[PDB]
């Protein structure tokens, strides 16, 4: 699975609760925590397309009310190889 799902949020409470939602809703392996700076914090998970989509949908729908909420929720199904060094 090369499908990449990921979301940033204002505050890390939503970040880690959404990460737990990612890993509990579907069989997806986390690959990144990112302190973006300025309050944005990014969770980055990797898995197959269906699991990634289901997990990210569930986590996003469960993430708004927690903390300061989401910043963005979109998914790229086939990242290019050259994007991997920029993980």
């Amino acid at each position: 699975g090369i499908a990449l799902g990921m979301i940033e949020t204002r505050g890390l409470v939503p970040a880690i609760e959404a990460a737990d939602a990612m890993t509990k809703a579907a069989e997806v392996r986390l690959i990144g925590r990112e302190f973006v700076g300025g309050g944005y914090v990014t969770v980055l998970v990797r898995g197959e397309t269906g699991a990634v989509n289901a997990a990210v949908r569930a986590g996003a729908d469960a993430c708004e009310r927690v903390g300061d909420g989401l910043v963005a929720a979109h998914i790229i199904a086939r990242p290019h190889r050259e994007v991997e060094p920029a993980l």
Partner: peptide, 22 residues
Amino acid sequence: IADASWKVGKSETDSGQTVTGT
């Protein structure tokens, strides 16, 4: 958000969120 093609537009899953993901 432009044509779906490259990027999915506003595909909701449960309640409200765009969750366009990838």
